[PDB]
From a paper:
To investigate the mechanism of DDM1 binding to the nucleosome, we determined the cryo-EM structure of the H2A.W nucleosome complexed with full-length DDM1. Three-dimensional (3D) classifications identified the class of DDM1 bound to the H2A.W nucleosome, and the DDM1-H2A.W nucleosome structure was determined at 4.7 Å resolution, in which the local resolution ranges of DDM1 and nucleosome in the complex are approximately 5.2-6.2 Å and 4.2-6.2 Å, respectively. In the DDM1-H2A.W nucleosome structure, DDM1 binds the nucleosomal DNA at SHL-2 and SHL+6 by crossing the superhelical DNA gyres. In the DDM1-H2A.W nucleosome complex, only 111 base pairs of DNA are bound to the histone octamer, and the entry/exit regions from SHL-5 to SHL-7 and from SHL+6 to SHL+7 are disordered. These results suggest that DDM1 binding to the H2A.W nucleosome causes the nucleosomal DNA ends to become more flexible, as in the Arabidopsis H2A nucleosome. By contrast, our cryo-EM structure of the DDM1-H2A.W nucleosome complex revealed that the N-terminal tail of H4 is located near the ATPase core domain of DDM1, and is captured by its acidic pocket. Consistent with the conserved role of the H4 N-terminal tail in the Snf2-mediated nucleosome remodeling activity, the deletion of the H4 N-terminal tail drastically reduced the DDM1-mediated nucleosome sliding. Our biochemical and structural analyses demonstrated that DDM1 binding increased the flexibility of the entry/exit nucleosomal DNA regions of the H2A.W nucleosome. These results suggest that DDM1 binding changes the structure of the H2A.W nucleosome, although we did not detect a direct interaction between H2A.W and DDM1 in our cryo-EM structure of the DDM1-H2A.W nucleosome complex. Intriguingly, the DDM1 Lys208 and Lys342 residues were crosslinked with the H2A.W Lys147 and Lys140 residues, which are both located in the flexible C-terminal tail. The structure of DDM1 in this study is similar to the published structures except for the loop close to H3, which was disordered in our cryo-EM structure.
Author numbering:
A (entry chain A): 61 to 134
B (entry chain E): 59 to 135
C (entry chain C): 26 to 113
D (entry chain G): 32 to 113
E (entry chain K): 184 to 395, 407 to 476, 485 to 675, 710 to 724, 743 to 758
F (entry chain F): 19 to 102
G (entry chain B): 23 to 101
H (entry chain H), I (entry chain D): 60 to 149
The structure:
Amino acid sequence: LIRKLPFQRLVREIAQDFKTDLRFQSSAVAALQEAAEAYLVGLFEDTNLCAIHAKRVTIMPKDIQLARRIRGER
Amino acid sequence: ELLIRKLPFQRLVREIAQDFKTDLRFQSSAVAALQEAAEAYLVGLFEDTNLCAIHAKRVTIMPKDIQLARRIRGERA
Amino acid sequence: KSMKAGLQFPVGRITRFLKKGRYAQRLGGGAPVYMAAVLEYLAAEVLELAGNAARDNKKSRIIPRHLLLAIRNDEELGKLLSGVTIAH
Amino acid sequence: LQFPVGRITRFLKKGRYAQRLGGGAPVYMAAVLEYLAAEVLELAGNAARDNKKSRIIPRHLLLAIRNDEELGKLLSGVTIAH
Amino acid sequence: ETVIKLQNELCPLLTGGQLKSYQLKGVKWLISLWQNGLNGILADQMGLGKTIQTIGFLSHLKGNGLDGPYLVIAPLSTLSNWFNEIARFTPSINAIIYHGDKNQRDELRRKHMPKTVGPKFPIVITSYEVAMNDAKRILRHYPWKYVVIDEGHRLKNHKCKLLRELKHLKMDNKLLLTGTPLQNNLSELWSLLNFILPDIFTSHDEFESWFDEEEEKRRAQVVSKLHGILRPFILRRMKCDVELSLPRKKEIIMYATMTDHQKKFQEHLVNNTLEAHLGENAKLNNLVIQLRKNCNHPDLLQGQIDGSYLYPPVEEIVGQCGKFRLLERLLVRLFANNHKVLIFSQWTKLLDIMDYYFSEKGFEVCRIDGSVKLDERRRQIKDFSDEKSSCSIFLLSTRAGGLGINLTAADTCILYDSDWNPQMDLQAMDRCHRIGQTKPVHVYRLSTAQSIETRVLKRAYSKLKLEHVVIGQQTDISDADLDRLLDRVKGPGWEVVLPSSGGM
Amino acid sequence: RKVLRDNIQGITKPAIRRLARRGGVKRISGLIYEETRGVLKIFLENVIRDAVTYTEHARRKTVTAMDVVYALKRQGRTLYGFGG
Amino acid sequence: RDNIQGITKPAIRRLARRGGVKRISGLIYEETRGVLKIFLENVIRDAVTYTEHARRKTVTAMDVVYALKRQGRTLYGFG
Amino acid sequence: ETYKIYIFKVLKQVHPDIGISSKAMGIMNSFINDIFEKLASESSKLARYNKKPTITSREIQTAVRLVLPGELAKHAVSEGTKAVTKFTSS
Amino acid sequence: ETYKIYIFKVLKQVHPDIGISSKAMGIMNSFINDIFEKLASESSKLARYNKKPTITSREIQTAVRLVLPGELAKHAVSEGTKAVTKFTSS
DNA sequence: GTGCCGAGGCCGCTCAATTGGTCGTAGACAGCTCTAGCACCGCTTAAACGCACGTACGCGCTGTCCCCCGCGTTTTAACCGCCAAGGGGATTACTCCCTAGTCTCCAGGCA
DNA sequence: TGCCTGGAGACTAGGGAGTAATCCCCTTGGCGGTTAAAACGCGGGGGACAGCGCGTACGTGCGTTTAAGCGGTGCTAGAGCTGTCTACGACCAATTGAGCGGCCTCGGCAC
């Protein structure tokens, strides 16, 4: 996993990026952490499949680029 | 403009739909809508697999590329 | 009647559609007004892009091909219309 | 009765999703909830017996859905906390 | 002398032939009605020969010097024959085939066509496909001042889109040329009356009353309003006393019972439970169609499921359906006497069945249908007409016989079944009954007793009675019984059609 | 002779070719064809199942364009221009 | 300020390891940093929209789950 | 408000030999409630599409068939038909 | 139900000099109708979520924000705030 | 240069939008309690960094079989028009019984 | 295990559910025929693909630093709940005018 309070400051930065004076609570921060973990690990699984299709053991960033482009969100 | 022949497509849809469940009946509008949907899905999968192939440093597309795109989409039954 | 807010959609018809949809037990007075406002912004935006496309291809008509090209070109409309498929 | 038909009708009225629901429809829908709970808990118990523990935990549940093809297909787009 | 003088003077340039008396009188009547500006319906004879009177009427217009564009619409199968006939009967008449694809359209519309009327303008022969497609491209670029159309029973209703193309006509001139004009009801007579005389047969409200003590007199009253004039007005002569050259012919209908396996199938089917029984052995909604199909032969339903592309042994076919096995003994009779036997049917799904039977029985395979192309169709016609060929079977689809195939050389014909259109049956038998036959053709129709097809046959007789009105104003046959019936009337299990002519 | 054509292969080889060409694919291989049969088939049953569900719900044993377009909406791909 | 550096290289390493990745290239880190910032910013945008809908000045797990459901991410574990 | 007692009864009747944790209880309750929400919404939405004013067991039929994949839908429709017949008889 | 004449008049407002086709009106009417449906459904569901028996402009703004894309949504909220101010002035 | 055909502009006709009023009640608002997030500090230790180093693997090139692509040619199936007689959806209206609403008795689920 | 809150049984009054009646545009195994597409043959040239060398970038081990995390501590802004009363919104009758169907003209566009 990732470290809870580092991810906490990251979410705080994201929030203050949009509009300020917003308060976060512990279960909300935890839920954000779980959701981010799930989405990122799924993306990595997809990129691993793309790379094994690419006949190379190494994953490069254009693998992730391809996975995102196929998934259809940018 | 329609690309797949309408009468072959109506045989396809009639026969498959009869397989799934009995006592069914379609019309011109239903056949046309199904045709449009099939064309859309096929062209989407084709562009997906074209991007996959060009990523694969290769120009000839194969069913393993098709299946890769199928797997990322995930609608395998 | 629409001149009270300066809008150009049928506040009455959209009111009747909210009512017949029974989407809620209670309907606000200005709710159709805001519905008409967002709808008129959307219509103006899409027709503006259609007109720009007509100017671009030196044509005096708007056709489903025009519509499809406009949707697939404009990033905002593409995002709003993800699984969009247009006949013809 | 197995699920609380009265209270589920209470929530369904709270939704007020139509003029009013069927007469036997609430019993039907309680029954279908019972059925679906039945298979999900059945396979949760199968996983627990595989691991031989006295309390079923989210890890067993996640294993159950990820391992049963049809249940995973139903729950493809969901993730389980922890 | 009077006939010769009239045919010469009234037709100053009918150079390539001669006109017989009564159709020549028809020509003078046509000329008079042209002088009256009224168009009429030609239906005279089952293609006795009509082109002769077409030139007879038309060449009078050229003889008077009344130049004007001519339009003809004809079926493809006979366009070349029609050109040969018009060339034969008058070499002095200019005519052209207007057929081919868009390329021949291009070459004709480049070279052969002047806008202005003139003697250099030839007769333009346009086929049906032209009539359906080229409406805008020609019918508006010509005020066709002469219009004649053949095989006029082509327009069976007001919705045959041939007619919707034709409403793009400058329809000043008309000549409906057809055979028998009645097609199963009143609708086609009404459609043809509107086409020929729309300004007269404007509305159907008045004549709608006659789809079906004082009513007996009203039958003449139906004739009195219109048909009292139509009978002189319709140029067509039924044979009362003119073609006694027509040889003797008779036809009989059988009424034997139907066997067991099919009655249990139809018991399942009438309750819509046939698929339930076949499911035990291992859902067609249009019940009347499946009733007919079962009447043909049970195989169709097995065949529906089957997979027995190659089908189980012949003796089973012998044992399933009684009509086919009675057919088996009657063909045993006919091959014993070595006649040339014609067979007709309605659906290929049984055509292939008895083709397989005939092949497995050791007999030659002679199969012609709409699925085979044209050149092998004539080669099979030549094989059948060959004297050295001993084949006594010609498996032909009834519907495909509308191309004018002449197979009168056969000596016998067996109409296995009859269609809902009776005149269709009449051309089906006409394929061998036309003038030129040398032997007494003898025809049997197989009808399934205690079946809905009996009712189909009875309503076919009802339509025959309608034909007659429009024109005018269960045993098993034993050896002794069959020999009695085919001596060279009324009976149990067999009926001969009573004389349709009301006295010589 | 009894005959029953393959039907499922009725999508002709040139049909796949210009489907791909409209899709911008340049170079294609052989088993693409059978794989496309499979893809079209599987994509077909999903919408067919949704459509038959709505036909059953509508008390009618005929399909209608409204039910079709609702089905396509349910599988999550909006089709327009047909009034749905 | 520039807090995204908190997502460390071994973090991506172990998350890819959980993803079954055997061999990670060097430029993966920045791309991952990106994809996470975009994903999280869509999620937070929806969450702040819902909190505005709530008339309240804090962010709660309930409308967080609402947002994740709206993003086609359905989450079980918090109601 | 949850279905804690009813899930407890279900587990004791089907698999009496194994208990459930608090977190597992909560997550499967969320499972039940989410199916609750989706079924109610789908039934209401299809009723509205039918321009139909009220909902009954037949709309529940079509909604359940829609939202359940094949084998699960067949089992669910079987048990639901039995339940509705039992209610009709009672 | 038809908006066709209103599509015509919006075309006159924006660019009256530019034409439009029958299938174009069809697709525009489908766009208007289903965007209407999406906004209404999101608002109704969110009103169900917040246990509010009323739907009004405020929840419509939040529904618009949650469903529309970003830039077009800030444009929409600006123009709709102007419109609601105009209607309040009446 | 042109003609043809589908969209733009026209009027006639109707039912839903409008206005006003009434009245019932959901929200706007103030205010309280409290509590949970938030800033702060300190100690601790697993974890992250850097770096040397090896090695294995992406890659770029080379070299060889194979099989789409284009093109041509011959077949043929879609597409269309048409024949045949009937039935499942559409639509309307009647009727009747299911249950919402309500009240009253009592038991079971949470602490 | 206590109780108090909701859950369950009974009367009535409508109005949706089902049932009966009526019509018609849709369906079905066959045909002519007619095109443009589609199926089969073949040469080839481009590419798919196996193998090798590399040299360079990432995994591994270990010393070194670092701040995340645990345990308290104070505090307070804002959430959760409640009482009021007030404006705003549902219901209903009469009115019209602008939205919807039919009809016609006239300019863009392949030819």
